[PDB]
């Protein structure tokens, strides 16, 4: 029947670039919708040849058994017989593509790239340099079980990094390896025991693992999202593969103990399709390291609004965390205290246009404590942040000798409320989590409290680690339509 | 029309070889795969091997791997077939057929017997 | 290698009444598989093609259906030269062709 990978496939010019392996275009999978550029750079040089990119091929556009049935795909060969390659032969197989979407007319165009390589500063670049030209590029994660984030293209902030799931949704393992994990992941799909396109026949099927097989599944799903819309842009895409992703389905006991909080836990999925709605996604900066004056800066995607800033230490030891502008655009900084690990900044990326959030900070009072909130026409609060300097201590509310502050965004369409839970003796955390059709804008802890590691959102639940109540503070924003 | 005239049935003496052809009509020779698949009466339907015209490319049943030889000869659109040192289980009616490349086979011959008898 | 099992070996049943065979395939091989009829003293001829198309020139009472393992061949109604045997046909990487063992249609009174 239907094989498990496309279970959560729901089936309702647009043009796929694969770059990988030759490919054996003959097979009645994806004959006659999958075209063989003469492109081809490959280090140190028959069915074989074929066996990566066939399967990849199948698993995108297959006929029988693949996501995004009869998809346009057109084939770059940029690795070898040994599925091996070069970060220079990837970069001219990238300006083929660039050159290509010149001559050929418009259109949306994804990038398929099921390889994997140490973290590259021209690779990335490239990546860049074809976001900015609106090309949604889909990456593997890698098959290391490592953190993506060491990885190029995975670690590119402008491509969609997929991990591998296996049919239980829990993380690939493959001998002392399996997928790839960490903040710089989007999202995991579905990329062990894979049905797809077999290169010995035109008509045989082979079943095969990795994180190409799972980025290849998201490239399908990408490519049916845009055949529906095709003027959607890579920050919709991006915060809809999100909405549209299983949650909480995998037992992150498979993760190290320091990447469980860093890797998403979503699983791809394309659900029956349905006005506007508010979307938001968590990103993690990376690690401040070990200084007094270190700092971690989160920032959003372009296209995308920074709605909160919350900070996080494994320690406790850190002095909270600022919204700044930079740019035309607010940014989250956390700060480190002296003898402190170092700190994690959280931001908070939601699609709401032209908001124009804007950052209103109320230095420390000394006083019964500090207070602060939104009075402009049409804003609404959507995140409240608080920073101090000292080594040891609508309204957003913070410690006496702490700076306070609140992100006010103009939006009509919106309503804003606030939610709280508060635990006397906790035990590790306490959660507070956002009623059904509400998204999650901010999570904060409740100033004066005894010991806090930090505040983190997980999707729509606000999460504060612990060592009065300890109370995690939710801020909940819907349309009002 | 497509044809497939099959040609050399008859007795072979065991320890002999049966020599079998298949002349083809009615279409491109060289673009479409043939195999041999012969068939014991009330028994199923035995591959023997496969020929690509146009290559010369042969695949052949593990079963007659030393004793059975393809070949062709595009310019009189023929197959050939050679089955050497034959014992009594291999008396079977044994056809060409055309091979639509990953599709079916599409036209068959009209079936040769062959007996192995001393 | 992948082996292709039809259930029943022999089929009995009365013209007019409809057949059902089924092919199972060991492997999963999408909806690639072909369907053959054998009349005595003549070579197979295919009926359906790629699990559901009607082979040409073949009546409409002859219908598959079936993708990845299940495999199904329907006859509505039961004519009297339909009483024959059925072969079911895949492709493979080695052996490159796999057939089944067949199902033979009989008449019973």
């Known amino acids: 029947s239907i094989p498990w990978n496309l279970e959560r496939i729901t089936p309702p010019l647009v043009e796929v670039y694969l770059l990988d392996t030759s490919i054996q275009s003959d097979h009645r999978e994806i004959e006659g919708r999958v075209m063989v550029t003469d492109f081809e750079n490959v280090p140190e040089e028959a069915s074989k040849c074929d066996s990566h990119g066939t399967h990849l091929a199948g698993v995108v556009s297959g006929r029988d058994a693949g996501v995004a049935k009869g998809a346009s795909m057109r084939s770059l060969r940029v690795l070898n017989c040994q599925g091996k390659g070069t970060v220079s032969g990837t970069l001219i197989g990238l300006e083929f593509i660039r050159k290509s979407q010149l001559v050929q007319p418009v259109g949306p165009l994804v990038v398929l790239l099921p390889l994997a390589g140490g973290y590259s500063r021209v690779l990335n670049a490239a990546c860049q340099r074809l976001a900015r030209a609106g090309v949604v590029l889909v990456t593997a994660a890698g098959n290391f079980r490592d953190d993506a984030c060491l990885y190029s293209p995975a670690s590119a902030p402008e491509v969609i990094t997929v991990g591998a799931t296996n049919a239980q949704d829990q993380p690939v393992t493959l001998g002392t390896l399996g997928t790839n994990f960490g903040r710089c992941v989007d999202l995991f799909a579905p990329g062990e025991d894979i049905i797809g396109a077999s290169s010995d026949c035109s008509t045989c099927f082979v079943s095969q693992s990795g994180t190409s097989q799972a980025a290849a599944h998201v490239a399908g799903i990408a490519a049916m999202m845009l055949s529906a819309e095709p003027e959607l842009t890579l920050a919709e895409l991006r915060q809809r593969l999100i909405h549209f992703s299983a949650k909480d389905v995998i037992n992150e006991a498979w993760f190290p103990e320091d990447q469980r909080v860093l890797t998403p836990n979503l699983v791809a999925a394309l659900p029956p399709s349905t006005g506007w709605q508010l979307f938001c996604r968590t990103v993690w900066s990376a690690h401040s390291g070990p200084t007094r004056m270190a700092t971690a800066i989160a920032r959003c995607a372009p296209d995308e609004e920074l709605l909160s800033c919350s900070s996080f230490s494994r320690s406790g030891k850190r002095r909270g965390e600022r919204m700044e502008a930079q740019g035309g655009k607010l940014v989250c900084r956390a700060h480190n205290a002296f003898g402190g690990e170092g700190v994690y900044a959280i931001a908070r990326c939601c699609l709401l246009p032209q908001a124009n959030c804007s950052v209103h900070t109320a230095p420390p009072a000394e006083a019964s404590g500090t207070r602060v909130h939104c009075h402009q026409q049409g804003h609404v609060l959507t995140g409240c942040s608080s920073h101090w300097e000292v080594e040891d201590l609508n309204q957003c509310v913070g410690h006496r000798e702490a700076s306070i502050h609140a992100s006010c965004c103009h939006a009509p369409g919106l309503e804003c409320k606030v939610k709280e839970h508060g635990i006397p003796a906790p035990q590790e955390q306490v959660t507070v989590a956002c009623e059904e059709g509400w998204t999650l804008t901010g999570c904060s802890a409740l100033p004066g409290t005894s010991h806090v590691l930090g505040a983190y959102a997980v999707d729509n639940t606000c999460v504060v680690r612990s060592r009065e109540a300890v109370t995690a503070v939710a801020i909940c924003c819907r349309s009002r339509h | 029309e497509v044809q497939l005239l099959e040609s050399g049935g008859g007795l072979v003496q065991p320890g002999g070889s049966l020599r079998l052809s298949c002349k083809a009509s009615?279409?491109?020779?060289?673009?479409?795969?043939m195999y041999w698949v012969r068939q014991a009466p009330g028994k199923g339907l035995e591959w023997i091997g496969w020929?690509?015209?146009?290559?010369?490319?042969?695949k052949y049943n593990e079963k007659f791997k030393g004793k059975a030889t393809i070949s062709r000869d595009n310019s009189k659109n023929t197959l050939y077939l050679q089955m050497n040192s034959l014992r009594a289980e291999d008396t079977a009616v044994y056809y060409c057929?055309?091979?639509?490349?990953?599709?079916?086979?599409?036209?068959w011959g009209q079936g040769t017997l062959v007996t192995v008898s001393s | 290698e992948i082996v292709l099992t039809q259930s029943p070996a022999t089929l009995s049943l009365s013209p007019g009444e409809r057949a059902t065979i089924t092919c199972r395939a060991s492997q999963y091989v999408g909806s690639y598989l072909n369907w053959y009829q054998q009349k005595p003293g003549q070579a197979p001829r295919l009926l359906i093609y790629?699990?559901?198309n009607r082979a040409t020139g073949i009546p409409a009472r002859f219908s598959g259906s079936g993708s990845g393992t299940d495999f199904t061949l329907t006859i509505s109604s039961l004519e009297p030269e339909d009483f024959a045997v059925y072969y079911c046909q895949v492709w493979d990487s080695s052996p490159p062709v796999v057939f089944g063992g067949g199902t033979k249609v009989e008449i019973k009174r």
């Open positions: 790629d699990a559901s």
């Open positions: 009615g279409y491109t020779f060289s673009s479409y795969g």
């Open positions: 020929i690509d015209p146009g290559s010369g490319g042969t």
């Open positions: 057929a055309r091979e639509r490349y990953g599709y079916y086979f599409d036209y």
